[PDB]
């Protein structure tokens, strides 16, 4: 395999960590290929669930717990910590809150969260690589609780970073916040990609095309599909009671991606850096509620 940049996988992986059976599991957890039957059933529907008051409550609870678990991981971002050690603590922190870590065995994904360094766009597999000064690292957390998934991510700084890093990370966050700012009943899902691409292009950056935000609730990924680039052809219109993610991946170079032989790790075909942020959103009459927001702090971690 021709690697697109410096970064390499670092094996062996620690034996897959188990989840005590007192935690409720999503379907895919015991499917031998990790397929979700309930997700396959709704495949090829463009039709968007309206959350009940009880759905909202489940989404609120799971998303707040997912925040807590991401806040845990954010505390560990220093040089010499391995993505594995992060995922270990994430895995434990999910157990303590009676949540199943949603990535675990999702289509055979073998770990409990996604850790993406530098040129990795998304879906990095926690491994033995110690984080190095100047790295950017995204941790993507998803928890499953009492039927509901909650999904968020932030990129972080590893020690001191270069001016390029700061600007990519900053800009990626602004792209997310600007798209969230436009969420309200009436808007076309396809519009967020216009706003995201417009601000990224303005700062000299590209928008990854092969990965999209998604609806999320009883299923981990479902409708809508929500592309992050301009003049996309997404279908649907926002309504109060829709829940979905915005999760833009932005790049220092071009937008093209390819997947490592592990079948998961997406990287920039050009080897340049990509940053991502993600929130799960609920549409309300006024605008939208950020379910995965911090409650204790004005800003994402990187801002401090
Ligand atoms: C291998 S699981 C990846 C899920 C990720 N949290 C997402 O936003 O889709
Ligand atoms: Co994903
Ligand atoms: Co090494
Ligand atoms: Co997501
Ligand atoms: Co995510
Ligand atoms: Na990255």
């Amino acid at each position: 395999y021709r690697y697109t940049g410096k970064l390499r996988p670092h094996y062996p992986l620690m034996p897959t960590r188990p989840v005590p059976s007192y935690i409720q599991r999503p379907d895919y957890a015991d499917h031998p290929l990790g397929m979700s039957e309930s997700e396959q059933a709704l495949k090829g529907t463009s039709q968007i669930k309206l959350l009940s008051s009880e759905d909202i409550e489940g989404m609120r609870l799971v998303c707040r717990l997912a925040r807590e678990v991401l806040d845990v991981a954010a505390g560990m971002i220093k040089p010499g910590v391995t993505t594995e050690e992060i995922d270990h603590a994430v895995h434990l922190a999910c157990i303590a809150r009676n949540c199943y870590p949603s990535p675990l065995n999702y289509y055979n994904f073998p770990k409990s969260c996604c850790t993406s360094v530098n040129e990795v766009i998304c879906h990095g597999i926690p491994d033995r690589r110690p984080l190095q000064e100047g790295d950017i690292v995204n941790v993507d957390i998803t928890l499953y609780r009492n039927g509901y998934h909650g999904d968020l991510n932030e990129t972080f700084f590893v020690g001191e970073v270069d001016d390029g890093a700061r600007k990519l990370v900053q800009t990626t966050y602004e792209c997310l916040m600007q798209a969230i700012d436009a969420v309200k009943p009436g808007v076309r899902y396809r519009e967020l990609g216009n706003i995201i691409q417009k601000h990224a292009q303005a700062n000299g950056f590209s928008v990854v095309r092969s990965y999209c935000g998604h609806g999320i609730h009883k299923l981990l990924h479902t409708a809508p599909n929500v592309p992050h680039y301009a003049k996309n052809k997404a279908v649907g219109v926002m309504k109060s009671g829709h829940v979905f993610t915005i999760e833009p991946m932005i790049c220092e170079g071009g937008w093209q991606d390819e997947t490592w032989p592990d079948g998961w790790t997406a990287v920039t075909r050009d080897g340049k850096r990509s940053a991502q942020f993600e929130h799960t959103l609920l549409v309300t009459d006024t605008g939208c509620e950020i379910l995965t927001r911090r409650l204790d702090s004005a800003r994402p971690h990187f801002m401090s």
Side-chain angles (χ1 to χ4, degrees), residues 58-69:
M59 294 302 279
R60 283 190 176 144
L61 169 64
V62 79
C63 292
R64 168 160 53 75
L65 296 168
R67 169 50 65 179
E68 294 183 359
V69 178

PDB file of all heavy atoms in Angstrom, residues 58-69:
ATOM      1  N   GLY A  58     -34.399  10.877  25.411  1.00  0.00           N
ATOM      2  CA  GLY A  58     -33.365   9.910  25.156  1.00  0.00           C
ATOM      3  C   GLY A  58     -32.196  10.555  24.401  1.00  0.00           C
ATOM      4  O   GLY A  58     -31.051  10.496  24.843  1.00  0.00           O
ATOM      5  N   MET A  59     -32.472  11.210  23.303  1.00  0.00           N
ATOM      6  CA  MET A  59     -31.398  11.978  22.630  1.00  0.00           C
ATOM      7  C   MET A  59     -30.650  13.022  23.517  1.00  0.00           C
ATOM      8  O   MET A  59     -29.431  13.105  23.465  1.00  0.00           O
ATOM      9  CB  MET A  59     -31.882  12.590  21.344  1.00  0.00           C
ATOM     10  CG  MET A  59     -32.215  11.532  20.314  1.00  0.00           C
ATOM     11  SD  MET A  59     -30.802  10.489  19.978  1.00  0.00           S
ATOM     12  CE  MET A  59     -29.954  11.580  18.846  1.00  0.00           C
ATOM     13  N   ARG A  60     -31.372  13.755  24.360  1.00  0.00           N
ATOM     14  CA  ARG A  60     -30.743  14.672  25.297  1.00  0.00           C
ATOM     15  C   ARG A  60     -29.812  14.002  26.279  1.00  0.00           C
ATOM     16  O   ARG A  60     -28.747  14.518  26.633  1.00  0.00           O
ATOM     17  CB  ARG A  60     -31.818  15.428  26.092  1.00  0.00           C
ATOM     18  CG  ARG A  60     -32.464  16.535  25.279  1.00  0.00           C
ATOM     19  CD  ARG A  60     -33.354  17.428  26.131  1.00  0.00           C
ATOM     20  NE  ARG A  60     -33.835  18.488  25.274  1.00  0.00           N
ATOM     21  CZ  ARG A  60     -35.025  19.065  25.306  1.00  0.00           C
ATOM     22  NH1 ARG A  60     -35.954  18.751  26.211  1.00  0.00           N
ATOM     23  NH2 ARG A  60     -35.288  19.992  24.399  1.00  0.00           N
ATOM     24  N   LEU A  61     -30.254  12.873  26.804  1.00  0.00           N
ATOM     25  CA  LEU A  61     -29.493  12.186  27.831  1.00  0.00           C
ATOM     26  C   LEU A  61     -28.245  11.582  27.194  1.00  0.00           C
ATOM     27  O   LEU A  61     -27.120  11.823  27.672  1.00  0.00           O
ATOM     28  CB  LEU A  61     -30.336  11.095  28.495  1.00  0.00           C
ATOM     29  CG  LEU A  61     -29.604  10.124  29.418  1.00  0.00           C
ATOM     30  CD1 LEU A  61     -29.033  10.862  30.607  1.00  0.00           C
ATOM     31  CD2 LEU A  61     -30.556   9.009  29.835  1.00  0.00           C
ATOM     32  N   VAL A  62     -28.435  10.795  26.135  1.00  0.00           N
ATOM     33  CA  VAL A  62     -27.263  10.158  25.468  1.00  0.00           C
ATOM     34  C   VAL A  62     -26.201  11.178  24.973  1.00  0.00           C
ATOM     35  O   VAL A  62     -25.014  10.985  25.206  1.00  0.00           O
ATOM     36  CB  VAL A  62     -27.695   9.162  24.332  1.00  0.00           C
ATOM     37  CG1 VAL A  62     -28.061   9.871  23.056  1.00  0.00           C
ATOM     38  CG2 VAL A  62     -26.591   8.161  24.064  1.00  0.00           C
ATOM     39  N   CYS A  63     -26.651  12.269  24.364  1.00  0.00           N
ATOM     40  CA  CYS A  63     -25.744  13.298  23.861  1.00  0.00           C
ATOM     41  C   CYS A  63     -24.978  14.017  24.984  1.00  0.00           C
ATOM     42  O   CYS A  63     -23.838  14.433  24.767  1.00  0.00           O
ATOM     43  CB  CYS A  63     -26.451  14.327  22.984  1.00  0.00           C
ATOM     44  SG  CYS A  63     -26.997  13.621  21.451  1.00  0.00           S
ATOM     45  N   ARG A  64     -25.556  14.105  26.181  1.00  0.00           N
ATOM     46  CA  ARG A  64     -24.875  14.836  27.281  1.00  0.00           C
ATOM     47  C   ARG A  64     -23.805  13.927  27.815  1.00  0.00           C
ATOM     48  O   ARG A  64     -22.738  14.386  28.238  1.00  0.00           O
ATOM     49  CB  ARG A  64     -25.904  15.190  28.378  1.00  0.00           C
ATOM     50  CG  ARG A  64     -25.331  15.674  29.695  1.00  0.00           C
ATOM     51  CD  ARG A  64     -26.372  16.436  30.504  1.00  0.00           C
ATOM     52  NE  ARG A  64     -27.606  15.675  30.673  1.00  0.00           N
ATOM     53  CZ  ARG A  64     -27.753  14.642  31.494  1.00  0.00           C
ATOM     54  NH1 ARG A  64     -26.732  14.196  32.235  1.00  0.00           N
ATOM     55  NH2 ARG A  64     -28.930  14.032  31.554  1.00  0.00           N
ATOM     56  N   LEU A  65     -24.098  12.619  27.828  1.00  0.00           N
ATOM     57  CA  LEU A  65     -23.153  11.623  28.306  1.00  0.00           C
ATOM     58  C   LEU A  65     -22.020  11.491  27.285  1.00  0.00           C
ATOM     59  O   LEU A  65     -20.877  11.276  27.624  1.00  0.00           O
ATOM     60  CB  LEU A  65     -23.853  10.270  28.582  1.00  0.00           C
ATOM     61  CG  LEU A  65     -24.910  10.317  29.708  1.00  0.00           C
ATOM     62  CD1 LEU A  65     -25.737   9.045  29.686  1.00  0.00           C
ATOM     63  CD2 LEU A  65     -24.269  10.575  31.067  1.00  0.00           C
ATOM     64  N   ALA A  66     -22.345  11.632  26.025  1.00  0.00           N
ATOM     65  CA  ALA A  66     -21.303  11.569  25.020  1.00  0.00           C
ATOM     66  C   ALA A  66     -20.338  12.713  25.170  1.00  0.00           C
ATOM     67  O   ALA A  66     -19.119  12.511  25.090  1.00  0.00           O
ATOM     68  CB  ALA A  66     -21.947  11.536  23.664  1.00  0.00           C
ATOM     69  N   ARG A  67     -20.873  13.916  25.424  1.00  0.00           N
ATOM     70  CA  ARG A  67     -20.047  15.097  25.796  1.00  0.00           C
ATOM     71  C   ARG A  67     -19.099  14.809  26.928  1.00  0.00           C
ATOM     72  O   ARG A  67     -17.904  15.144  26.860  1.00  0.00           O
ATOM     73  CB  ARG A  67     -20.969  16.316  26.144  1.00  0.00           C
ATOM     74  CG  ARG A  67     -20.315  17.540  26.808  1.00  0.00           C
ATOM     75  CD  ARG A  67     -19.070  18.038  26.107  1.00  0.00           C
ATOM     76  NE  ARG A  67     -19.339  18.550  24.767  1.00  0.00           N
ATOM     77  CZ  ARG A  67     -18.427  19.053  23.949  1.00  0.00           C
ATOM     78  NH1 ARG A  67     -17.132  19.066  24.276  1.00  0.00           N
ATOM     79  NH2 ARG A  67     -18.816  19.545  22.771  1.00  0.00           N
ATOM     80  N   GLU A  68     -19.613  14.180  27.991  1.00  0.00           N
ATOM     81  CA  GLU A  68     -18.795  13.900  29.164  1.00  0.00           C
ATOM     82  C   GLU A  68     -17.638  13.004  28.847  1.00  0.00           C
ATOM     83  O   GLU A  68     -16.546  13.184  29.344  1.00  0.00           O
ATOM     84  CB  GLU A  68     -19.628  13.214  30.254  1.00  0.00           C
ATOM     85  CG  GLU A  68     -20.717  14.087  30.834  1.00  0.00           C
ATOM     86  CD  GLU A  68     -21.460  13.376  31.975  1.00  0.00           C
ATOM     87  OE1 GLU A  68     -21.122  12.233  32.275  1.00  0.00           O
ATOM     88  OE2 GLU A  68     -22.356  13.975  32.559  1.00  0.00           O
ATOM     89  N   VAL A  69     -17.912  12.019  28.007  1.00  0.00           N
ATOM     90  CA  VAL A  69     -16.906  11.050  27.609  1.00  0.00           C
ATOM     91  C   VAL A  69     -15.914  11.742  26.669  1.00  0.00           C
ATOM     92  O   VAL A  69     -14.732  11.485  26.737  1.00  0.00           O
ATOM     93  CB  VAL A  69     -17.609   9.804  26.987  1.00  0.00           C
ATOM     94  CG1 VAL A  69     -16.598   8.800  26.516  1.00  0.00           C
ATOM     95  CG2 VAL A  69     -18.575   9.156  28.013  1.00  0.00           C
TER      96      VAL A  69
END
